[PDB]
Amino acid sequence: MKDLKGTKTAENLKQGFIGESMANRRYLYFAKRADEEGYPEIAGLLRSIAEGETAHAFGHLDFIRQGGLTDPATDKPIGTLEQMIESAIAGETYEWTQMYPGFAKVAREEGFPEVAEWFETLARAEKSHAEKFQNVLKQLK
Amino acid sequence: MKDLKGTKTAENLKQGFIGESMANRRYLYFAKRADEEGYPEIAGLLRSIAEGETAHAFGHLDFIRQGGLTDPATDKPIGTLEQMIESAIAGETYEWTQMYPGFAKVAREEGFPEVAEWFETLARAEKSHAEKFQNVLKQLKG
Ligand SMILES: [Cl-]
Ligand SMILES: [Cl-]
Ligand SMILES: [Fe+3]
Ligand SMILES: [Fe+3]
Ligand SMILES: [Fe+3]
Ligand SMILES: [Fe+3]
Ligand SMILES: [O-]
Ligand SMILES: [O-]
């Protein structure tokens, strides 16, 4: 499609993607509370609305990719499958090398060791994810 | 740990939630490409890792709620089910009354009519979602 680089629309697609991604997660989490409390029609509606937000997020990504823009999460191209895997590696690498260890250090300093332990678990998990994606890329290449 | 308000850890839980939410969406989108091209093991790995990112996002929300913090998307409390639905209503109302119409106008003015039409479709969709959540709240209240 038409080149979107440098436009306000490019930034709006990114912000739309972020919001739709959060909406799907939020509504599935809310649905679990409706499930527990015995509101199956509410829970089912939440889950169906969440599928709408999936469609919205994926459509934002379609326009991002067709317009020559980069991944909202990593600023890396996601045109081809190899590029997609390279974006996954980059994001996971940021999370285990910088983001979650830093979150863990701050949580410990602020006196929240249980939250710190969670952030440390997540740091190890993202390193595992990064390693698994690196193996995929080697195999594609 | 039950009062995290005003701490850096509170902001980090919010940012972690945002990143994990995007990761799940991204990896499921990437899996469709692996599917089409005939890489079922890659697609399966993407889907399985995406379930990990769901667990991470939900765990961040657990700590947010237990610490008395608000919904990352709307800054509203999400302790009870009614509060959760009220947060959904507020977010959807922002999206249909302000966010997507504004995005659509910018897209039209910049010469991207297909993107504008998509944003207009989404504005109407979020208005419908808001009405459905309003119905849910009516049902919870009797
Ligand atoms: Cl129900
Ligand atoms: Cl495969
Ligand atoms: Fe949406
Ligand atoms: Fe990750
Ligand atoms: Fe994660
Ligand atoms: Fe929405
Ligand atoms: O949305
Ligand atoms: O992640």
Author numbering:
A (entry chain B): 1 to 141
B (entry chain A): 1 to 142
Sentences from the paper on this structure:
One such protein is sulerythrin (SulE), a ruberythrin-like protein isolated from the thermophilic archeon Sulfolobus tokodaii. In contrast to other members of the ruberythrin family, a crystal structure of native SulE shows that it forms homodimers through domain swapping, with each monomer contributing two α-helices to give two four-helix bundles that each harbour a solvent-accessible, single dimetal site. The exact function of SulE is unknown, but it is presumed to be involved in reactions against oxidative stress.
In order to test the effect of the total absorbed dose on SpReAD analysis, data collection at higher flux values was repeated on the same crystal used at 5% beamline flux, choosing distinct, non-overlapping positions at least 50 µm apart. Using RADDOSE-3D, the total average diffraction-weighted dose was calculated to be 0.26 MGy for 5% flux, 0.52 MGy for 10% flux and 2.70 MGy for 100% flux. Fe-2 and Fe-4 were therefore modelled in these distinct positions, with occupancies refining to 0.32 and 0.34, respectively, for position 2 close to His129 and 0.68 and 0.66, respectively, for position 1 equivalent to that occupied in the maps calculated from data at 5% and 10% flux. The SpReAD analysis was then repeated for the data collected at 10% and 100% beamline flux, refining the f′′ contribution for each of the two Fe-2 and Fe-4 positions observed at 100% flux separately. While there was no difference in the oxidation states of all iron ions between 5% and 10% flux, at 100% flux a clear difference was visible for Fe-2 and Fe-4 at position 2, where the edge position was coincident with Fe-1 and Fe-3, suggesting that iron ions at this position are reduced. Indeed, the total dose of 2.9 MGy taken up by the crystal at 100% beamline flux is close to doses that lead to photoreduction in other metalloproteins, such as insulin or heme-containing proteins. The study presented here shows that data-collection parameters that lead to a high total absorbed dose indeed result in a partial reduction of the metal in question, and that this is not only visible in the corresponding electron density but also in the SpReAD profiles.
